[PDB]
Amino acid sequence: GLPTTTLPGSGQFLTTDDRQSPSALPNYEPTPRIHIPGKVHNLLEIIQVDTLIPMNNTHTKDEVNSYLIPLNANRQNEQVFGTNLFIGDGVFKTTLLGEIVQYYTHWSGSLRFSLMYTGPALSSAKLILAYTPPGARGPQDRREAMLGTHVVWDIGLQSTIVMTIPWTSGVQFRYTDPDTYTSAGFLSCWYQTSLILPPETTGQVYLLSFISACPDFKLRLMKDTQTISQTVALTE
Amino acid sequence: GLPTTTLPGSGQFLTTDDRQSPSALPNYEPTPRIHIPGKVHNLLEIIQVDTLIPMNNTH
Amino acid sequence: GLPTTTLPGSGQFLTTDDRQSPSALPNYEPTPRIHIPGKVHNLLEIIQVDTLIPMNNTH
Amino acid sequence: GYSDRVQQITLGNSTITTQEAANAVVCYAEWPEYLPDVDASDVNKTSKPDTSVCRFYTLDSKTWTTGSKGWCWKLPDALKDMGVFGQNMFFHSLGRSGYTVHVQCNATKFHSGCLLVVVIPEHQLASHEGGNVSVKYTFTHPGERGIDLSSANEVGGPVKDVLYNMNGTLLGNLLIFPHQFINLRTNNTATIVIPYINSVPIDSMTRHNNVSLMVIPIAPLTVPTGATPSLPITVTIAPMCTEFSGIRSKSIVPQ
Amino acid sequence: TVASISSGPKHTQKVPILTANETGATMPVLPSDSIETRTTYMHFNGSETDVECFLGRAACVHVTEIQNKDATGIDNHREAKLFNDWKINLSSLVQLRKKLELFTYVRFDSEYTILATASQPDSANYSSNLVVQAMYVPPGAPNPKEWDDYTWQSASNPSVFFKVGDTSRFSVPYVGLASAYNCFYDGYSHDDAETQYGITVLNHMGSMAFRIVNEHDEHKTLVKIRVYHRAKHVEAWIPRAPRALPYTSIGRTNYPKNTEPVIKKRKGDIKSY
Amino acid sequence: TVASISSGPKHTQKVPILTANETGATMPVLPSDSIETRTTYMHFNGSETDVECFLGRAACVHVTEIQNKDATGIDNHREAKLFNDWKINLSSLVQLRKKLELFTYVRFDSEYTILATASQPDSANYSSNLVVQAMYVPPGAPNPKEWDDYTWQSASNPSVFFKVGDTSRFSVPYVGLASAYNCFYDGYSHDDAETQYGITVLNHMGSMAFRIVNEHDEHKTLVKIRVYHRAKHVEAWIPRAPRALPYTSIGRTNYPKNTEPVIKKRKGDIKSY
Amino acid sequence: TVASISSGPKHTQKVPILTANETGATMPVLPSDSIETRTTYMHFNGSETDVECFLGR
Amino acid sequence: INYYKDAASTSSAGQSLSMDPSKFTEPVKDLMLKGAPALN
Amino acid sequence: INYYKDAASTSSAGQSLSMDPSKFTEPVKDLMLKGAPALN
Amino acid sequence: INYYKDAASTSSAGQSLSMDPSKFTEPVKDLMLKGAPALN
């Protein structure tokens, strides 16, 4: 008989501990694995695939239309859309990125925001996208917007433009749930010159917008998502 | 005295676990084995012998 | 199963003991350290800096 | 002078040419291949009709109009009646296949509109009734007709609400599945190569569909002034590396 | 590892930021393709986002309850909670369910922890000490009928006996019939016109049965069982869109009617911040 | 090591005892610079004044309380202490607080010990055996609302279950967002005219939630939770003046008005002994 | 280990499927003696049918 | 590691991995070859 | 040290440290180079 | 012997045995020698 002493914590059950256990089914042989395409190893692998952002959130019931950012022909100087960058809330929240970020407490890294244009091929347009780093207000006019991170996008044969929100930060991690100290800025978009439709054409054209994370990205300290809850256990 | 911590499951009895136990009969000597024809090792050995099927179940 | 005996003191919590514990946050990666001037290692380092004595205590 | 843009796919006795492609997607970066022995379980030698089943079948055409919500086809169902592919299907106990899907929609440089073409492995549909109402067989086996998401709820059928992918997930995130867009201004076809994806090496072709192909208008169709307000969309699909096993009497399936 | 390299002004014919999303790719664009950057290192590995880590902590998967009371004159033990069961399954409680259904097929060993606590809602002199016996009853094995049937002998079926207030813990290998469990199944069990649709017909694995071994004392004792499940040795294939609407049933994808808009409406314009 | 060397009479032009304190230095003067000394050795290392040792013993950081009782008809569990929380923090109880605030920035892993004892202030037949479930609820995770919410499933959030009367112990890595925790912060969360001032806005880290898993017995049971915290792997920068006045608030430096003189007045003259 | 070997058409004078059960033997006939098979491996050892396992709980 | 002195006290035995059905499936005195005629 | 005989009884697995998003982010048939035109 | 995988779970650290008061006691820009005049 070897002398032992038990410490504080004996008998506790910590849902996060990782130890060995007896197998209830001694000697059982599991089914062989066969090959299946698509294996995922890290959630970091999947948040780099871009998905659509319901940017046009202004509706009243969920609709395919809140994915469409409208553009008006012949407007000059004006603003196309605006949003803050609380990736865990608001427009971002239902996107795959938003949806995964919510399983973690802290995030750090660059984001990739792209816009794909869908107007007739014989039209043309020049837009400016601007990222405003924390510390200033959402820009109120392009002059204000153009003094921060921006890209003049020229609509052409190449249909999409990929803007990166480079990680601009004092503190090396931000909270995924919106927090002030930790806030990330604003994203706005304005006409640089203006949309022009060809003859025989009319109305609004739309941009689709996507979001995905750069390879830069870090997420840490897992927790429970506000995105799902329940009141009684389900049954069959 | 070596410091320990006990985990969840301590004291449980799992009918399928396989561990050592003290022998109640210390030092006892079992009867020698003699040879007996017919030893079975796997149930897989015996399910290969065919047996009759009551196919005509209608009684 | 290895035979053990527990000694007096089992289960006690001594605020001054120093042992290992399971991490509640398995696999979490702490923020990198950056350099900060001023690191203290011993209280003996700081009690050698002189400070003023309110000698005139009479107020 | 090769462009990403022009392409030719020849499979069996049938060929497709596109002069306005946008590359092609190969699901999960894997190309269809036959079933290796190391992965095999059924001891039966399989049948590989090759060129008689691995050719291009063009399903009947759809009509995109400003009110369209989107269409959904299931595989191998959509092909249950195409030539010898279909016969093999009803006649063997098990079968396995990959596909090349080519979705076609051309317009002019004055039109606008953008379709999402996506392949969803194991697309289990939801009942519009809620609770634990099931979706009857016939409803998930529309055949070449596919399911029309702008048709009405029916009884025992699935829900046809587009912002929810027919299953409780948002349209916006379908982009995590192999997919390609058809943006009239860029593109006129979409091509996806689908490797066989299952948790078993070979399965039944009638009780289980392993992918739904979905074509969904996202930026509404907008035709030039006084143009007819609609465009046809055509889907052509070719089984590839098909294998059938466990031949017998010929399945009889509901309806 | 560098998180960003140093990059300076650019005036090229080589534009990495113009792409064609119609192709289905997400081109790997970085901050340094469109602004001037400085070197920085990652200092991080992505350890805690590994799927083994993501699915590897215990989650509550089931809460049931049984009572110890005089069975004298009870015509239906099962019905008196003289013992209860659980037609096993993991999609019953939703926190863990949404996590698993981020994948189509999943393969793992399970580690179960079972916590049992007792309640004595009405006047008792004391708290008795009860031993629970949770037993696995696979498909085809004779379900028990009374709280003290021959079934409980469990001569071939793994069973664990632990005390109420304590915890039991054991681990079961991956018992799936195929190579993976599907989290999801667009099929039927056969081509029947009315057979059920979904994984419910696949994910068939028996049920687990609990009972108190103790005979009855003078008062009644409520014992409530909580089963926790931890995946170990995880393997996951084919990511899918996360669950947006609420769940209604074990094993079907169905969402409730007149549900509410899941995308938050702006308080303001598209232009609003 | 010598504590003092031998030194004899001196009649020099080299005076180590005259200095200019205006410079900000504390010149390292020793007994042997001004009296005649003999050799002596230190016999000591300064082991127990290491900051790891100074901050490394468990200190009580929080006492809360929850009760097990029939929740039937309770409109606000939180309010009935059917479960309670703690918007986590270390500066709440002052013994450990004064120790930490001897430094400006501090970095360490935490080891928590949680002791839970039960009380039955009014007539009970017995002492029941309750299991506590303390769960970590980080910022953004859905706080629980009833004592038996879906929240308690805690499928992704670390939780520990232990018995009242026992102790639970686990250790959490340094969870700070920056490189160190500041013990102190002369800033705001943004340039707002009315935003709060101090570390309160920095030291934001979630809250910990406790509840009893047991349903109710016939009597009521008070369970009082004590959380102890031990720093391990300590790193401290920039020493500061010790706290002289009493504390009034978590996270602000504020002292109470009409406080009392903190320097003891002489009973006598400056000249007094 | 192979569970089944590959075997093709047969037109022989050597018939493994005709036997005389009166002898008391169970002749070791396999799928490949009477249909055309493909190779497949066992992937299994028969561990949990060992008598030690069967009587050991 | 055995902690105990007696052999009965050790854990379960380990798989025969013996397996030879012929004592049960082919106890015939003159060897039968599959493919050759049963009765000559 | 494993104390138990079966593999299911061992603790959690250890980090894939595999990580290759290209099956998801770039499943295109003809390789796309960043910087070269998307559609030629 | 660490029984646990993560570094936070190890016991207390071990004595700096670093000790250098000069950053606090003599942060002067031009070095002062004891015995030499303070102000020259």
Ligand SMILES: Cc1cc(CCCCCOc2ccc(C3=N[C@@H](C)CO3)cc2)on1
């Ligand atoms: C997807 C998906 C994943 C799962 C989980 C399947 C679990 C496998 C079977 O689980 C058990 C549970 C309990 C016992 C048991 N044995 C006794 C000692 C007690 O409980 C055995 C197997 O179900 N669907």
Ligand SMILES: Cc1cc(CCCCCOc2ccc(C3=N[C@@H](C)CO3)cc2)on1
């Ligand atoms: C300065 C200074 C130092 C600190 C302490 C910060 C502590 C980090 C977060 O602490 C916890 C506490 C509890 C749990 C917990 N997990 C579950 C098993 C139970 O409790 C997790 C993290 O705060 N300010």
